[PDB]
Scaffold this active site. Sequence first.
Site, short mmCIF file in Angstrom:
data_model
loop_
_atom_site.label_atom_id
_atom_site.label_comp_id
_atom_site.label_asym_id
_atom_site.label_seq_id
_atom_site.Cartn_x
_atom_site.Cartn_y
_atom_site.Cartn_z
CE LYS A 91 -1.67 1.29 3.70
NZ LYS A 91 -1.90 2.34 4.71
CD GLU A 124 14.66 3.94 6.19
OE1 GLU A 124 14.79 2.91 5.47
OE2 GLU A 124 14.99 5.08 5.83
CB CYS A 181 14.93 8.66 3.88
SG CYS A 181 16.18 7.51 3.29
CD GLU A 200 12.01 12.83 9.75
OE1 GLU A 200 10.89 12.36 10.06
OE2 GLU A 200 12.80 12.20 9.01
#
Lengths: 502, 502
Positions: B186, B261, B295, B396
């Site tokens: 997905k 992750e 990333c 972040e």
Amino acid sequence: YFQSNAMELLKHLSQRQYIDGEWVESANKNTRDIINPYNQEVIFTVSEGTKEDAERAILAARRAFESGEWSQETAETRGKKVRAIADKIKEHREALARLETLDTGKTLEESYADMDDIHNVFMYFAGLADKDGGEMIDSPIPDTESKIVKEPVGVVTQITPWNYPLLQASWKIAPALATGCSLVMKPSEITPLTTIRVFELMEEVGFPKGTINLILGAGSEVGDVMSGHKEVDLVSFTGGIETGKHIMKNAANNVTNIALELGGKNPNIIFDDADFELAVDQALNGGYFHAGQVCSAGSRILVQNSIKDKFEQALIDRVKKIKLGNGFDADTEMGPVISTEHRNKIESYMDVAKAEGATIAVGGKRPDRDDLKDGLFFEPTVITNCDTSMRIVQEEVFGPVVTVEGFETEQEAIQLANDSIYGLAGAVFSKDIGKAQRVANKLKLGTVWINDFHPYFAQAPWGGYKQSGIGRELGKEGLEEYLVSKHILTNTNPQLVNWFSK
Amino acid sequence: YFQSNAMELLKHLSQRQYIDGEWVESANKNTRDIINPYNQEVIFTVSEGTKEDAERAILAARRAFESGEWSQETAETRGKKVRAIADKIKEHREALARLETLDTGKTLEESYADMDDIHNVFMYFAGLADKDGGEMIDSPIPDTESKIVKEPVGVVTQITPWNYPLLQASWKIAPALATGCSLVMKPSEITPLTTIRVFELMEEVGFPKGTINLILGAGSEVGDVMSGHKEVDLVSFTGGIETGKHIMKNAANNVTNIALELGGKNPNIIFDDADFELAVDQALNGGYFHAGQVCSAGSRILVQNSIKDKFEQALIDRVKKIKLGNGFDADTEMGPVISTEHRNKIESYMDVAKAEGATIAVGGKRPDRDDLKDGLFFEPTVITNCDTSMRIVQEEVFGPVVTVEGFETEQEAIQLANDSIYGLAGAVFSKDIGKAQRVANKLKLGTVWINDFHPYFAQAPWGGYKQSGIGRELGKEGLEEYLVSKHILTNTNPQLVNWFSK
Ligand SMILES: [Cl-]
Ligand SMILES: [Cl-]
Ligand SMILES: [Mg+2]
Ligand SMILES: [Mg+2]
Ligand SMILES: [Mg+2]
Ligand SMILES: [Mg+2]
Ligand SMILES: [Mg+2]
Ligand SMILES: [Mg+2]
């Protein structure tokens, strides 16, 4: 005078926790009484630690890890110290075996075999410590060097069960120390004796302050601290499925790695072309070693319909001859179960078998014999006329109880064996080795024995498929749970990219 | 006519989910509009699946897995099919690059580089498929044979992010297919285009029904089904930390393995003995490739105090020259951010920097230029006079924003770099390679670059220490997440044990 000597051993055993290089009481002075399951007598009293004690141990483990005194020690030297622990286990084999029998109830012979295994676990990991530091990679980028370095994962928390306390401790301690981690261990509140003793032995070898820590008890929120503290890098838990799931949910709060071993519904598949005498012997051994409380127990017997009646009557006839008694007595073949709560749990599962319509072909109660009356005994039991839809077939009872189901074909044996939520271990008995190998490749189990029951050893990984767990203990894979990979890429001819305008 | 051609590509792209070998709408016919971030125009409309669709896909994946059509295919043959996918990516490199730019906004050059990487990911795993089936063990028990067999883990659910959608898909698809698993994927609800396309390409190669499945959207409880269904054996999630933690808690209900992750606060450490010109170039590259949304982005610059002023003014001068624009235009150096919500998130983080007392040295707003007005642009930003206690340094932001902190010594750089909850990747710039190597060995990061910024490749494992994740993708370790070990022990001379009385 085996038992009274073991009792005198206790007069030299520590009663305290071991935190940051010191033996210490609980922060609130609470204690817990430890019982001999053979006679339910209190044999020892130990500290019952608090959640602040656990917190303190984890912070000490972190400080020790960051100091590098153990984590940056050479692997060769770490291996030498792990070997020194192994050698201490062998030196003290008798005393440790006796202490294990006192605390857990299993026969002295079972305990001696266990001490030999534990020595071999430590020796295996001692030898593995300096054998693999990482990899050199053939980089796809010109003028770069790429390497993968293995480092210890950091601070590990280790929670062990009451079934084979020192053995399970060794599976966790040995790789943690070999890799350079710092650890905090908490044995079952029921059976701390041999774990306390092994900590005394490790202190004799000598490790940097904080590298090893021992928390005792089942204090409020201690488990939660050990699974949920921000400074933990790995939680390694062996025990019940419901606790394991809670531990994993706790661990998620700080993205903490988990290794879980959560039990099993281990099948013992007996084809009509098995060696019949062998299969009966090993069905007994599967069901009733350590009164069915060892994690490898074969509680779910699947037997080919053609010999089912023959098999049932052979098994039942043997079960009636099993000698119950004190683990210290040489003639004992099966000891007591571990605790009042556990025997009650076992008894409530028999309530279920009855409510579901199965037959208790033999056993299913506490023995009456005068010498067994004060202890936590339960008769070896065989349950027949049961099927896979029953709770007594599907749920882990962890007692001296087997169920017997029939199957017609190889395909049906595989389908039944795999029809549980678990996946730890199981066996296939057949002289047709090719058939046994077909079955073994289709069983969703971490360990499959062909014509045997129970073997595990340091050289090979042990653990579950399905809800039996996450990860593996033993072998190289067991070591790897305690390591983390770091890719260091060096550009040996660095150039400006000049993507952005100057 | 690059963009209008990419738009005409869409007239041939599927709009549906792919479940159990068929392209299908959502069970309730819901759809979702997909946007081009450059101009916020709706470019496509796709199915928005339901939780019952996800359930159906997972059951199909299970049925396919049990059938053995893929799981029992030879590894060599599985590798050939994975190579065929690789070759399709290369054949369609232009179209896929253009589709990626349309959907995500990044420059066409970035997208082309990405398509080359993706081809190499598939090719790497194609080659790895048949290289390791397990181990033979030297058993410590005489007259036994011990082997460890690697098997595919089973049914995997794979959830990918909006930052580098096809690349992240490839990291998950390639090992799953190489090992013989069945998968349900997905993609982010925001950026499904290239994932739909790769599914069309995989269908062209041909896999057994149910082996691959594609669910689209962010439907109610779809995520929960994908992490919490009893039939899933592994959940592999790449995305935000809060979602990842929820996924792990869900996975615990059925003892499901997880690979996570979860982002990073990646440091870029610049010593005063770095090549200065290089360090400025790579600080730009770290901060602003894919508008800081890749990333590997280096948002946290740590620069030695001796050259901090020099560095700041060089960096700021360059940041003012960065060319923003349409990803399809050759002169563009930085495209837009991905969505309205994400740009707002970025803007609310600037509210924080201000409330904390930091200086926005350049940028920190949306550009005004007429041609950028309709798009989701945000100016490349440099934040100065900040410290490690600030939210803007610790959290972040995932945007075209860097912070600059000074350090005096090597020890302080290491302590600052490690002072975050994250641990994904980072760099050290210094001509003193020995120093750089000391620093690299002390940084708690899954990947450390020495005199470079950004490199990752199929040959080496990628993933986080600390709260950046669990497990690794790429390399052999990436493959291993999709395999389970089974120890088969055969007793070649079985004997009765005769523990229990006859
Ligand atoms: Cl048969
Ligand atoms: Cl320096
Ligand atoms: Mg002493
Ligand atoms: Mg070379
Ligand atoms: Mg962690
Ligand atoms: Mg077409
Ligand atoms: Mg041999
Ligand atoms: Mg599972």
